[PDB]
């Protein structure tokens, strides 16, 4: 059973973005600057997947996963005397960590990169600041 298919990843990103936690003012706690490195690495991986074979891309996928968990554990915002982890929440609700483990070829890698692009598009569509 593959969580990310060619038919529902956009809807998955939509539901994930709708489920992201917000502030007392309705503003998104996650910012694009918190995930800027993750998005750059996803774009470079997507660009490189078109020509290079998946054999030399495994180190890049591993580093991408390492960056995802590091940003999940690193970014934290304290508001109203309460702390939150916006990147960790985005990863959990968007179901990203185990979506990375199913990257076994070029098709799964490009599916994940398109899923991340959809997540960013719907995050910006709902008031996600930069």
């Amino acid at each position: 059973m593959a969580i990310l298919t060619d038919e529902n990843y956009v809807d998955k990103a939509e539901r994930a973005i709708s489920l992201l936690e917000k502030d007392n003012k309705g503003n998104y706690l996650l910012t694009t600057s918190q995930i800027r490195k993750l998005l750059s690495l996803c774009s470079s991986l997507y660009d490189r997947s078109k020509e290079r074979k998946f054999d030399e891309l495994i180190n890049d996928v591993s580093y991408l996963r390492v960056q995802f968990v590091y940003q999940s554990g690193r970014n934290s915002v304290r508001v109203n005397r309460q702390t939150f982890f916006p990147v960790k929440d985005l990863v959990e609700k968007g179901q990203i960590l185990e979506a990375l483990k199913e990257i076994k070829d070029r098709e799964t890698l490009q599916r994940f990169c398109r899923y991340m692009e959809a997540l960013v598009a719907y995050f910006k569509f709902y008031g996600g600041k930069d």
Binding site: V10, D11, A118, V120, A121, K124, F125
Partner: protein
């Protein structure tokens, strides 16, 4: 004959041939009436190459019709070979066939159907054995041809071009179309009939000319000279070769292009045959109301279109019956077409519709190509269950009311607005929103996401609080994108129109 022009000077020729052929039809009608000793009172309808008459049912009338048709067919064979061909038609009927209290609908249809069938049979079989043998005699060694109509007969040199006699006469008459008086002489002017030529002559010289009949164009006033009055749509703002440059405004805004519109009344012949027969169990099928319908369309399309075209940078080349041909700057062409359609739908209470094709073209485009492509667009608009307008290709075919209400006066307005508030850096997303509308069937749901993203970027590339104003576009163009395909096509056409309006080149 009107539209086949291949070289420069095609505008002057084009209008001259349109007027020449309308006057050919009028002269055919008047000479046929003169040969029988009748007058224009017997003429029910003349225009578009079609004319109807009520005549006495005598053997002399049939004879005079046959001999007149033979003589004019010989004249057409001599002067234009097989390009033009006239076919005559007639059906015998009684008084009781047209009185509403005594007639029935199918007989009032059959009185037209007999003449129509006989005209069709004469059109199928045109020339006899002797005429065909005379045409196929060959034996002419001509090195050179006419540069406009490619005719070989009577080639002459003029302005270092090689024109035939008819082309020569039409070039001469193109300078005479500015006058309002046109006389019929025996050998001076464009040959319009057997031993009869048409010459456009100014008023002050009319006392110095010999003629058999005189015509006055676009005048209701009974002048000092007893003349036959004709009405044609002849509005002209400037020359056709200037219309491409005239689309630019005072600030230089606007694409350097021109447009040609061809418009047609929907089911005009069905309207004439049985348009009134729907009410009163067919009691409304007589000659009088059909011919009042004909005069209503004649006054709408030969006199009134000139008022609809007032203060517009365009020229109405052909306007008679149901076919309308106009050419000018593209904005004025679109506005003229919309205004004409609205005034028609108000004139006829909604009961008859139009179909329109509006082709865009660049400077110096040969007129035959423009006419052909615009005819294809008109046919495509007809194919959309009629009552449709097709702009610049077959892909943007809309119902006229949909194009008017939703595109021209709704979206294009709600785009000029927001998009005159964005710079050139943000007036490029207009191209991007076009591509996402042309590519929705690929990647339907991520093409929508790609939109949400790209729309919220135009609303950040804006200016301080000018951006609290582009917060509407995002909500607006999003729902236009997500409703259905018709609004996507409407938004696509609106964006293309705005791009053509604000182009600086």
């Amino acid at each position: 004959f009107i539209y086949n022009i291949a070289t420069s000077g095609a505008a002057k020729q084009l209008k001259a041939r349109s007027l020449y052929l309308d006057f050919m039809s009028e002269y055919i009608a008047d000479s046929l009436l003169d040969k029988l000793g009748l007058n224009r009172a017997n003429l029910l309808y003349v225009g578009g190459g079609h004319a109807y008459f009520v005549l006495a049912n005598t053997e002399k009338t049939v004879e005079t019709l046959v001999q007149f048709e033979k003589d004019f067919n010989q004249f057409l064979l001599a002067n234009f070979q097989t390009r033009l061909y006239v076919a005559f038609g007639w059906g015998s009927f009684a008084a009781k066939d047209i009185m509403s209290e005594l007639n029935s609908p199918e007989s009032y249809r059959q009185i037209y159907q007999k003449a129509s069938r006989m005209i069709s049979e004469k059109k199928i079989s045109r020339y006899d054995y002797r005429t065909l043998m005379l045409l196929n005699r060959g034996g002419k060694s001509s090195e050179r041809e006419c540069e406009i109509c490619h005719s070989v007969e009577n080639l002459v040199s003029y302005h270092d071009q090689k024109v035939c006699d008819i082309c020569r006469g039409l070039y001469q008459f193109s300078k005479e179309i500015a006058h309002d008086h046109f006389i019929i002489t025996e050998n001076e002017g464009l040959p319009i009939g057997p031993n009869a030529c048409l010459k456009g002559v100014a008023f002050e010289k009319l006392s110095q000319e010999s003629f058999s009949r005189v015509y006055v164009k676009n005048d209701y006033k009974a002048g000092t000279i007893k003349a036959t009055h004709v009405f044609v749509g002849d509005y002209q703002c400037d020359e056709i070769h200037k219309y491409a440059a005239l689309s630019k405004n005072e600030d230089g805004l606007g694409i350097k292009r021109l447009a040609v519109v061809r418009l047609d009344v929907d089911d005009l012949g069905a309207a004439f045959m049985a348009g009134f027969s729907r009410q009163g169990n067919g009691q409304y099928s007589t000659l009088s109301r059909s011919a009042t319908f004909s005069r209503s369309m004649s006054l709408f399309f030969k006199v009134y279109i000139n008022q609809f075209a007032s203060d517009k940078k365009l020229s109405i080349i052909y306007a008679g019956g149901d076919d309308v041909f106009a050419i000018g700057s593209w904005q004025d062409i679109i506005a003229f077409t919309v205004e004409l359609r609205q005034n028609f739908i108000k004139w006829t209470n909604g009961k008859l519709t139009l179909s329109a094709g509006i082709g865009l073209f660049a400077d110096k485009t040969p007129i035959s190509l423009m006419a052909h492509q615009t005819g294809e667009l008109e046919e495509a608009a007809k194919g959309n269950e009629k009552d449709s307008i097709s702009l610049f290709s077959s892909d943007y075919t809309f119902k006229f009311d949909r194009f008017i209400t939703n595109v021209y006066d709704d979206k294009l307005e709600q785009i000029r607005y927001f998009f005159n508030h964005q710079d050139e850096r943000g007036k490029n997303f207009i191209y991007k929103l076009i591509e996402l509308l042309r590519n929705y069937e690929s990647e339907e749901k991520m093409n929508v996401a790609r939109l949400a993203y790209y729309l919220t970027r135009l609303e950040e590339l804006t200016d301080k609080d000018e951006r609290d104003k582009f917060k509407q576009f995002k909500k607006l163009f999003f729902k236009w994108y997500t409703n259905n395909e018709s609004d996507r096509k409407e938004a696509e056409l609106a964006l293309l129109l705005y791009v053509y309006e604000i182009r600086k080149d």
